[PDB]
Amino acid sequence: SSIFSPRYDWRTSGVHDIAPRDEGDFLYQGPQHVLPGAHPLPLHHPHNTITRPVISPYIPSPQRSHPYFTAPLPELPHFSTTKPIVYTYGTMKERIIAPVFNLKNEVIYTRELDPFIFGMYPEVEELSKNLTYWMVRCQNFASKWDYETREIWRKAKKNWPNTGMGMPRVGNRKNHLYTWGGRTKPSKPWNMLMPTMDVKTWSKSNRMMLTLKMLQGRLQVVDRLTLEEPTQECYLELCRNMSWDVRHTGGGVLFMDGGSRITPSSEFDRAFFFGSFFNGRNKIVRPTVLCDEQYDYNKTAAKQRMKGPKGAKNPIPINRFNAYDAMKHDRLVITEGALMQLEDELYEHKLQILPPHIRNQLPEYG
Amino acid sequence: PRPAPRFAMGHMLPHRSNVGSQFLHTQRHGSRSTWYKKHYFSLRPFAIQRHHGTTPRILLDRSLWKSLWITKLQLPDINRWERVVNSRRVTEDRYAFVEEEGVMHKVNWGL
């Protein structure tokens, strides 16, 4: 039960059979003995770097601010950011440079990430606002229906007159008291809330999720997401070559497909997107961390034959990027086209944030 | 810009209390909150999972999804045992545990 209740500490015997299993079990040798799973911190998921492998140059550490190249390394071509870079409030205040992978899995040129996007340092309250938004939004609201007292179909009459009987005082037994009845205030979709999100919070929370992925070394940048044929096993071929793990049980992959550096697209690359349907753990999302402003055309009651929920009539579409799917799939794969689109659509946003004495030097600084 | 109500995250469908909200979704009238709870002393079924909410990623044969316990369908072979290994459905042989030399030995369940 709860730790405090006397129910806890029941089962003073029997919980174990006293006899070891003759296979798996063993005695504790001493302090020099490495126990499987044993770790000094409360890790709910005790993944090491063998089970949930990471790609970045360095295994993320307290000594390193982040696990990527801090300065462009002389043996690889270095591409600078698409738009110039300004350091705003919650940004890392450091150079972040990530290697770009080919589709044959060797490294090709190195590319610099924008600290306003991949450098926004994560703090849990914001990620919370994001996540609960998602999990509430993603229910099926049409199934939340239930029967109400007026919906029951009995006769409306006093079913027996109350005077001298020892019976209960009853009329019209279609109430909630009765096995066949239904409630006064039942559940039904139009009374269930769909939360509004504000574009600011969606922006900031998403960017912190990206940065969280980057600080864990779970981030990977790629030339193009492309297949030879639209088929599935070409996609599974690809996934085998890049050591992406798409099995249901293994840590999955989250694809942001933007197209390549030279030819960025809003649209999914057809060949990839078609073969990308595979029963395992993987997802493909649009290359935007923003969202349209949400609106309500019954903010009061006005339209009564609305089925709907109450709330934003414009909820974030499912294939977008969010905290939930960033948590559930570990390796996040982003195409350069998507990098470019992010930087571009976020640019004037990040500019409008700056304090006015800085903003005035912007045209002078180029 | 009020954060999404946390109670509504779906992890929770309590049974219709005194206190609640207009946006709190409680369960249907006349349907209990925990499925295996037919009585108050009713036990958690052992290896039997009930997938709930989302579609399951892997669906064992001996588990429940939009279903009832149908036994001929649920375990086709009783002498066999079902488990998820390396993200696949797999079937070993059911073993029973028996104390022997002071240790616990696995023997074939069926015979």
């Binding site: 919906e151 029951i152 179909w153 066949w180 039904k188 139009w190 006005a302 009564q304 | 006349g30």
Partner: peptide, 22 residues
């Protein structure tokens, strides 16, 4: 409302979304 119910098996009324105050 129960599966076998004769009550809800014959459809009675269906409550709308009720209108809010000024």
């Amino acid at each position: 409302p129960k599966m076998g119910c004769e009550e809800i098996t014959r459809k009675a009324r269906r409550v709308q979304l009720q209108p809010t105050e000024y």
